């Protein structure tokens, strides 16, 4: 049995002094990075004046030959709107997908020009975001396909065949010549002859998406290999400086190119790069390694080092490497490379770029809660960094070959004068991108200009593959701070364009201050609360420190005991085993006797007044202190969660962050709301599941405590140790022992707590079937006030994702693999049913199966493990029985093969099952099992019906670029957490308030603003909780009441209409590149069980004011109280004799004395299907209390999280950059 964490994340090699200096700079504060860059970038006054003069001459030439774009002349010639221009280019793109030119021309003449375009040509507008950038210069994340369809019809009906022909020829000139150098390497080489004669050189990239499968990585390998042959044949001995070279993207060559998979990278990716480099060496051409995301930088250095020390590659100086000046590590990376060049004797070609992933890096750091960004946040800082790094490179031209890749004439001029008068080919060069640098560099290359060479980066590929690259270039070019956008902006003077960033930064008040409008990850929520902090598992210092803390955590004698108010109690003790290796004993749990569980509730009841008397702000202060303790203890908490619950390090980090966020969110919500009149319920039993053994455990308890209730905490039997540690932390934070008792044990302990006479409320997260048993036990109970015992029951899901033909396969596959198999599918939010539009199903399924087989399953104390075990042998057996049933029915089953080492634990391999119908599934299967169904586009609405028809309603995902499909699907789906163009396992506290409907939950949502109000006897008004909209059926009913003479009830009805928050529509603060929306809708059909006429009118007013329909108990005998209803109200009203036949309901309102309420509550608990949130009142309470029925629980919360960067970039962030 291997020692825990003994092999957690060893680095590829011992970190040299130079490597450690890189890692140290990873997230260095921006104010600390800039001063040394300003110093290194400083030049003499004479040089600065000379550089400004050169820059002005270049810009004057650039603006002096600036002709209008072809698209702009087309828009002008035919008086096209922007949407017409975009629609025309989409049409042209489709028409160019027809190979036979005469067949295309006949389709244009005979069919398209005659208006009938929808008939003959997957949406025509799938790529309209790209063409929108071309036409408008602005990126819209989704496509308004109805606006585009209208615009296309309008323009064809107005201008006919001529505009179509012009659009086709315009698109042809762009896709085949402007953005790409050629569709094949041979075509690109043909097109390169013209500028090579004018003094340019080339570097070709067979660019595309990163590999998601082995097969795709192999395809990119053979594409690169064939291109090296073609380039080397064409080079014909010109060498690495005067002749062409290739650029490669390491992520194209292996599907798991990451620090977490460093061993596979060195074992599998490195030999492939070596083989390509050997071929480049034989032809004597350049081979440049492109730079990608910040978390791949240092990993790529390990490949660079091995390759440069490999004697088989000696004699060749063509190996090249990109470094990104927007990165805080850039000068230290250059120090490392220059030293490696010296050690190896290889003159490394160093391509200095500013950086292509800026908006993505901002979003990633925010999502991950990291200390700071790995890139600068002011564009001028990147410019200073670039010039400072150029100075370092120009001092080392004997050992490296600097390649200054930029389109900025000011940057260029500064380096041109920095480099001085001595020049020879091979000393350094400039570089640019095909189709955007030639205007500038035709003023540079050649003895009649500056006589400095330029290498053109030449993308090669079909139009299909060119889209992702094209979006980035156009988004970049239209960016607020972009040199290209500013040189085209007539309100920007040449004086502004030639301003020296070094001197501008030097004179700022705080040199290197972060951008004012970009929040550090800790500050995402501003004054409301401090964001939890994560850990960077790409940082070697973090990994080394975490390795030690994790090992230390495994040496601790973790215990869980019954912690009663009076002290620990004795009980039956057993060991807690690691689910991934039962030989690894994690701790010991002493479980609670049923006698002591009953005793604990009595102790809580006796302690309830004292805890209630602690002022809410001081209760909140306890939660904030517990959050601080959990943050500081995160590494140790990670280690415990990893071994006790079978979680990977990434999942444990997220788990502890979520616990911290719950604590701080409920503390702040308390400070915003709770006062003396919001009395506690009393002892609350918190029963929690194994699968989020710290986060959900902490969230329920924290909310109950801060609302003023003493808590009986009953953790899942599988995961008591982290629970006991959470209670220990809460007690250390100031929660009295009498206010928080821990009762380890199985469901019998949970049941003993639920049944205890003094139990005043139950918070349950777990399976629907156990929730139903708790509901039944509570159905014969009332509070001392004669009201139902509140139950929050958050239960299972059958979560779907719908994918149409507009979605990007690689994005879908990544989000599907994550959503379905993260934590071995043991998230309530996990993706269970993937729904693929028929036309793209085969391609996505092939990619999905390929990506499945790249997952590493094993004991989770290794960074390289993606998917851990399932929690128990019983869970394993349940899951495997489901798989074998499906397989026995003839369904296609794909499974990863497991390693022999999994035999010591309980593992289920990630599994894909192809279903015929959604009805093949009957219940949640809580494991790593993805089901796949296919649908025809016209059946989308029926498919949404089928998804809703399971009765669940927890998480739901949609991948589409099309606004009509977003509006359709999101309006018809009935689930609590929606996710657009991203994974569906997001539950960020206060950002995606989490919780569903139907079989998935009662609500209110955890991590949302209605939660605390369920835990007090009188609910406060939550922050931002109001709506100016009034339900119109409510209004009709209030008028009907006035017509019947029920004047008091009509007034109460109008008041409910105003008090209702139905229609609340908020955007919640969160990370950039995401829109997080929170809305209040009707719940559905509410069961009304009235006793009196006035009671019925009040119940109906409450239900209608919150948008609901109703089924009224026919046994009430009150049918004559609703004569002559307006049709609008009658449509919402049904009469029910057999309640179980007329459901499912979404809540209930009951009127009666205590024995009537108890009887009705028992009948309601017996109804099939969802647990119903029941509110009850006496006739007298209805007369006395306008809030007898609380409208908070008659609406349904919906969270929607939209990935607005999904089209390829963040438009709003580029507009402030
Ligand atoms: C010419 C070339 C370029 C590249 C490659 C090869 C060649 C030959 N390869 C390639 S491999 C696949 C992609 S291309 C390559 C690239 N990129 C990459 O990462 N890896 C790679 O391998 N590029 C793209 C460059 O990094 C860069 O985006 C552009 O050249 C634009 O910069 P500029 O001309 O200096 O304009 P500029 O003066 O307007 O500056 C724009 C830049 O400033 C930065 N910026 C903008 N806003 C900022 C803010 N608020 N805070 C801080 N910084 C900000 C950001 O980097 C932005 O791109
Ligand atoms: N909606 C959400 O937010 C959410 C979140 C996480 C998990 N879940 C659901 O939780 C389930 C998996 O977690 P689990 O396996 O621990 O759930 P579970 O129902 O098996 O047990 C949950 C808790 O109930 C207790 N329990 C069992 N029987 C009981 C009884 N008769 N009376 C009182 N308590 C009893 C258990 O000891 C445990 O503490 C899944 O269905 C998952 O979807 C829902
Ligand atoms: Mg269970």
CA atoms 886, 887, 890, 891: torsion sign? positive
Long-range CB contacts for residues 214-222, cutoff 8 Å, separation at least 24: 214/255, 214/850, 214/853, 214/854, 215/850, 216/255, 216/847, 216/850, 217/252, 217/253, 217/254, 217/255, 220/252, 220/253, 221/253, 221/272, 221/276
Ligand 2 lined by 402 (C-beta under 6 Å): no
Ligand 2 lined by 777 (C-beta under 6 Å): no
* Site to substitute for ligand 2 among 770, 775, 923, 924, most atoms within 8 A of C-beta: 770
Rounded to whole angstroms, the Cα distance separating 685 from 765 reads 11
Are residues 355 and 324 in contact, defined by beta-carbon separation less than 8 angstroms?
A: yes
Using CB distances shorter than 6 Å, the residues near ligand 1 are 290-291, 322, 324, 326, 351, 353-358, 375-379, 381-382, 405-408, 411, 431-433, 457, 476, 481-483, 515, 1217
Task: Burial-class residue 119 by CB neighbours within 10 Å (0-12, 13-18, 19+).
Answer: exposed
Residue corresponding to tokens 């490669």: 248
Q: Which two tokens stand for residue 15?
A: 């970190």
Of 389, 454, 828, 835, catalytic: 828
Distance from residue 363's CA to the centre of ligand 2 (Å): 34
| Parallel, antiparallel or unpaired: strands 348-353 and 287-289 | unpaired
3-state SS, residue 457: strand
Rounded to whole angstroms, the Cα distance separating 1084 from 1053 reads 19
Task: Residue 37: name the closest of 331, 327, 297, 324 by CA.
Answer: 331
Task: Residue 939: name the closest of 838, 845, 816, 840 by CA.
Answer: 838
Distance from residue 357's CA to the centre of ligand 1 (Å): 8
Task: Burial-class residue 866 by CB neighbours within 10 Å (0-12, 13-18, 19+).
Answer: buried
Rounded to whole angstroms, the Cα distance separating 53 from 408 reads 14
Q: Which two tokens stand for residue 628?
A: 């601080």
For residue 1122, which phi and psi values (nearest 5 degrees)? Answer: -125, 40
Secondary element (H or E) of residue 539 = none
Count of C-beta atoms within a 10 Å radius of residue 825: 24
For residue 430, which phi and psi values (nearest 5 degrees)? Answer: -95, 165
Name residues whose C-beta falls within 8 Å of residue 1130's C-beta, 6 or more positions apart in sequence.
Answer: none
Angle between helix axes 128-136 and 82-96 (nearest 10 degrees) is: 130
Distance from residue 974's CA to the centre of ligand 3 (Å): 27
Ligand 2 lined by 770 (C-beta under 6 Å): yes
Task: Burial-class residue 187 by CB neighbours within 10 Å (0-12, 13-18, 19+).
Answer: middle
Q: Which two tokens stand for residue 161?
A: 């065949």
Are residues 745 and 573 in contact, defined by beta-carbon separation less than 8 angstroms?
A: no
Rounded to whole angstroms, the Cα distance separating 816 from 808 reads 12
Give all strands of the β-sheet with 558-560 in edge-to-edge order: 558-560, 581-591, 572-578
Task: Residue 953: name the closest of 800, 1100, 782, 727 by CA.
Answer: 800
Q: Which two tokens stand for residue 779?
A: 């159905």
Task: Residue 89: name the closest of 135, 45, 51, 50 by CA.
Answer: 135
262-280: b or e for each residue (b if 16 or more CB lie within 10 Å)?
bebbbebbbebbbebbebb
DSSP 883-924: HHHHHHTT-EEEEPPPPGGGGGS-----EEEE-S-GGG--S-
Residue corresponding to tokens 């003159």: 347
Distance from residue 324's CA to the centre of ligand 1 (Å): 8
Rounded to whole angstroms, the Cα distance separating 235 from 229 reads 10
Rounded to whole angstroms, the Cα distance separating 604 from 983 reads 41
Rounded to whole angstroms, the Cα distance separating 768 from 765 reads 9
For the chain, how long is the longest CA-to-CA vector? 103
Rounded to whole angstroms, the Cα distance separating 1134 from 191 reads 74
Residue 305 has, within 13 A of its CA and on its CB side, a CA count of 18
Give all strands of the β-sheet with 1109-1113 in edge-to-edge order: 1133-1136, 1109-1113, 1085-1089, 1147-1151, 1174-1177
CA atoms 1137, 1140, 1141, 1144: torsion sign? positive
Name residues whose C-beta falls within 8 Å of residue 685's C-beta, 6 or more positions apart in sequence.
Answer: 601, 711, 712, 714, 750, 753, 754, 756, 759, 761, 762, 763
Ligand 2 lined by 1002 (C-beta under 6 Å): no
Residue corresponding to tokens 């003959």: 120
Q: Assess whether 1196 carries a catalytic annotation.
A: no
Q: Beta partners for 202?
A: 456
Q: Which ligand 1 atom sits nearest the alpha carbon of residue 485?
A: 39
Are residues 1067 and 1076 in contact, defined by beta-carbon separation less than 8 angstroms?
A: yes
Q: Which ligand 1 atom sits nearest the alpha carbon of residue 437?
A: 1
Q: Which ligand 1 atom sits nearest the alpha carbon of residue 1216?
A: 50
Q: Beta partners for 204?
A: 246, 458
Q: Which two tokens stand for residue 785?
A: 């006030």
Q: Assess whether 794 carries a catalytic annotation.
A: yes
DSSP 1156-1181: HHHHHHHHHHTSSSSPP-EEEE-HHH
| Parallel, antiparallel or unpaired: strands 1065-1067 and 1074-1082 | antiparallel
Ligand that lies nearest to the alpha carbon of residue 690, given by its number in the listed order: 2
Task: Burial-class residue 161 by CB neighbours within 10 Å (0-12, 13-18, 19+).
Answer: middle
1074-1108: b or e for each residue (b if 16 or more CB lie within 10 Å)?
bebbbbbbbbbbbbbbbbbbbbbbbbbbbbbbbbb
Name residues whose C-beta falls within 8 Å of residue 640's C-beta, 6 or more positions apart in sequence.
Answer: 553, 558, 586, 721, 722, 725
**Range list of β-strands (E), 235-371:** 245-248, 287-289, 319-324, 348-353
Q: Which two tokens stand for residue 59?
A: 């810009």
Rounded to whole angstroms, the Cα distance separating 168 from 162 reads 10
Task: Say how many residues make up the chain.
Answer: 1217
CA atoms 303, 308, 309, 315: torsion sign? positive
Count of C-beta atoms within a 10 Å radius of residue 290: 21
Which residues does the chain break after (C to N > 2.5 Å)? 121
Rounded to whole angstroms, the Cα distance separating 1095 from 1102 reads 11
Angle between helix axes 634-645 and 616-632 (nearest 10 degrees) is: 80
Rounded to whole angstroms, the Cα distance separating 223 from 216 reads 10
Count of C-beta atoms within a 10 Å radius of residue 1127: 7
Distance from residue 993's CA to the centre of ligand 2 (Å): 20
Ligand 2 lined by 689 (C-beta under 6 Å): yes
């Amino acid at each position: 049995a291997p020692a825990p964490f003994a092999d957690f994340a060893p680095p590829v090699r011992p970190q040299s002094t130079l490597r450690r200096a890189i890692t140290a700079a990873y997230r260095r504060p921006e104010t600390e990075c800039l001063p040394p860059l300003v110093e290194a970038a400083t030049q003499s006054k004479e040089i600065r004046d000379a550089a400004a003069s050169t820059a002005r001459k270049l810009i004057e030439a650039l603006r002096g030959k600036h002709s209008g774009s072809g698209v702009e002349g087309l828009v002008q010639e035919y008086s096209l709107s922007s949407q017409e221009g975009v629609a025309l280019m989409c049409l042209a793109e489709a028409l160019l997908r027809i190979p036979d030119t005469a067949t295309r021309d006949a389709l244009i003449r005979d069919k398209i020009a005659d208006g009938n375009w929808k008939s003959h040509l997957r949406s025509l507008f799938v790529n309209a975001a790209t063409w929108g950038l071309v036409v408008t210069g602005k990126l819209t994340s989704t496509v308004n396909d109805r606006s585009l369809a209208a615009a296309l019809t309008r323009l064809i009906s107005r201008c006919g065949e001529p505009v179509i022909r012009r659009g086709v020829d315009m698109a042809m000139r762009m896709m085949g010549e402007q953005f790409v150098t050629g569709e094949t390497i041979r075509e690109a080489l043909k097109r390169s002859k013209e500028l090579e004669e004018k003094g340019f050189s080339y570097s070709y990239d067979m660019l595309g998406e990163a590999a998601t499968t082995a097969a795709d990585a192999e395809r990119y390998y053979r594409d690169y290999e064939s291109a090296i042959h073609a380039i080397g044949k064409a080079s014909a001995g010109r060498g690495i400086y005067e002749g062409p070279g290739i650029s490669i993207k390491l992520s194209a060559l292996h599907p798991r190119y990451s620090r977490a998979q460093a061993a596979r990278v060195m074992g599998e990716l490195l030999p492939r790069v070596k083989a390509l480099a050997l071929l480049a060496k034989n032809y004597d051409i350049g081979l440049n390694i492109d730079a990608e995301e910040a978390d791949r930088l240092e990993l790529s250095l390990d490949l660079l080092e091995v390759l440069c020390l490999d004697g088989d590659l000696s004699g060749w100086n063509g190996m090249g490497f990109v470094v990104q000046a927007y990165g805080k590590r850039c000068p230290f990376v250059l120090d490392f490379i220059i030293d490696l060049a010296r050690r190896s004797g290889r003159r490394i070609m160093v391509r200095l770029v500013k950086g292509a992933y800026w908006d993505a890096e901002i979003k990633r750091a925010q999502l991950d809660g990291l200390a700071d960004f790995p890139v600068f946040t002011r564009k001028i800082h990147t410019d200073v960094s670039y010039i400072a790094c150029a100075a370092k490179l120009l001092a080392a031209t004997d050992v490296v070959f600097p390649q200054f890749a930029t389109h900025n004439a000011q940057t260029l001029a500064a380096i041109y004068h920095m480099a001085g008068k001595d020049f020879h080919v091979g000393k350094y060069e400039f570089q640019c991108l095909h189709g955007m640098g030639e205007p500038l560099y035709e003023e540079v290359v050649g003895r009649g200009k500056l006589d400095r060479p330029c290498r053109i980066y030449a993308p090669v590929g079909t139009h299909e593959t060119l889209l992702a690259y094209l979006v980035r270039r156009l988004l970049e070019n239209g960016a607020n701070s972009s040199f290209v956008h500013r040189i085209n902006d007539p309100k920007v003077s040449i004086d502004e364009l030639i301003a020296d960033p070094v001197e501008v930064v030097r004179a700022m008040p705080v040199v290197g201050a972060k951008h004012d409008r970009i929040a550090l990850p800790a500050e995402l929520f501003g004054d409301a609360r401090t964001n939890s902090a994560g850990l960077d598992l790409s940082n070697e210092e973090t990994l080394a420190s975490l390795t030690e803390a994790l090992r230390e955590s495994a040496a601790m004698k973790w215990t869980a005991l019954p912690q009663l108010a009076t002290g620990p109690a004795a009980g039956e003790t057993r060991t807690v085993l690691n689910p991934g290796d039962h030989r690894d004993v994690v701790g010991s749990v002493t479980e609670t006797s049923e006698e002591d569980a009953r005793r604990a509730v009595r102790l809580a009841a006796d302690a309830a007044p004292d805890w209630a008397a602690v002022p809410p702000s001081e209760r909140a202060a306890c939660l904030d202190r517990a959050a601080e303790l959990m943050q500081a203890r995160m590494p140790t908490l990670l280690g415990l969660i990893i071994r006790e619950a079978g979680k990977s390090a990434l999942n444990a980090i997220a788990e502890v962050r979520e616990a911290i966020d719950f604590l701080r969110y409920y503390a702040e919500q308390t400070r915003r709301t709770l006062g003396p009149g919001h009395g506690p319920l009393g002892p609350i039993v918190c029963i929690s599941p194994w699968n989020f053994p710290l986060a959900i455990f902490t969230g329920q308890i924290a909310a109950a405590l801060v609302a003023g209730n003493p808590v009986l905490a009953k953790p899942a039997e599988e995961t008591p140790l982290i629970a006991a540690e959470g209670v220990r932390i809460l007690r250390e934070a100031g929660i009295p022992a009498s206010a928080l008792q821990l009762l380890p044990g199985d469901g019998r302990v949970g049941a003993a707590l639920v049944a205890a006479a003094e139990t005043a409320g139950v918070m349950f997260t777990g399976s629907t079937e156990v929730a139903r048993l708790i509901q039944a036990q509570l159905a014969d109970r009332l509070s001392p006030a004669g009201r139902p015992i509140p139950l929050i029951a958050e239960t299972g899901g059958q979560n779907a994702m719908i994918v149409d033909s507009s979605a990007l396969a690689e994005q879908v596959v990544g989000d599907v693999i994550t959503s379905a198999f993260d934590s071995a599918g043991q998230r309530c939010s996990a993706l269970r049913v993937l729904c693929l539009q028929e036309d793209v199903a085969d391609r996505i399924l092939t990619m999905l199966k390929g990506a499945l087989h790249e997952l590493h399953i094993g004991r989770t104390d290794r960074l390289s493990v993606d998917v851990g075990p399932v929690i128990t042998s019983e869970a394993k057996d349940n899951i495997e029985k489901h798989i074998e049933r499906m397989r026995g029915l003839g369904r296609k089953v794909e499974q990863i093969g497991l390693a022999s080492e999994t035999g010591v634990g309980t593992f289920v391999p990630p599994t894909i099952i192809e279903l015929e119908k959604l009805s093949d599934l009957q219940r949640e299967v809580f494991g790593p099992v993805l089901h796949v169904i296919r649908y025809r586009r016209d059946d989308l609405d029926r498919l949404v019906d089928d998804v809703n028809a399971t009765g669940y309603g927890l998480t739901f995902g949609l991948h589409t670029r099309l606004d009509e499909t977003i509006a359709h699907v999101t309006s018809r789906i009935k689930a609590g957490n929606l996710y657009i163009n991203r994974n569906i396992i997001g539950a960020v506290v206060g950002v995606q308030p989490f919780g569903g409907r139907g079989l998935s939950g009662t609500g209110p949502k955890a991590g949302g603003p209605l939660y605390l109000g369920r835990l007090v006897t009188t609910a406060p008004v939550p922050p931002q909780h109001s709506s100016v909209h009034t339900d119109p059926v409510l209004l009709d009913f209030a008028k009907w009441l006035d017509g019947k003479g029920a004047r008091a009830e009509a007034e109460a009805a109008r008041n409910a209409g105003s008090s209702s928050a139905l229609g609340l529509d908020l955007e919640l603060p969160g990370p950039v590149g995401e829109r997080n929306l929170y809305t209040l809708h009707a719940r559905g059909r509410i069961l009304l069980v009235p006793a009196t006429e006035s009671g019925l009118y009040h119940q109906l007013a409450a239900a209608l004011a919150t948008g609901n329909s109703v089924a009224i108990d026919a046994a009430s005998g009150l049918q004559a109280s609703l004569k002559n209803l307006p049709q609008t109200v009658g449509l919402r009203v049904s009469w029910s004799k057999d309640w179980a036949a007329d459901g499912p309901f979404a809540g209930a309102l009951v009127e009666g004395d205590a024995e009537r309420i108890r009887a009705v509550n028992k009948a309601i608990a017996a109804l099939p299907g969802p647990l119903l949130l029941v509110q009850a009142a006496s006739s007298g309470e209805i007369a006395r209390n306008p809030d007898a029925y609380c409208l908070n629980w008659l609406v349904e919360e919906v969270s929607a999280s939209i990935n607005t960067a999904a089209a390829g970039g963040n438009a709003s962030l580029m507009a402030i950059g």
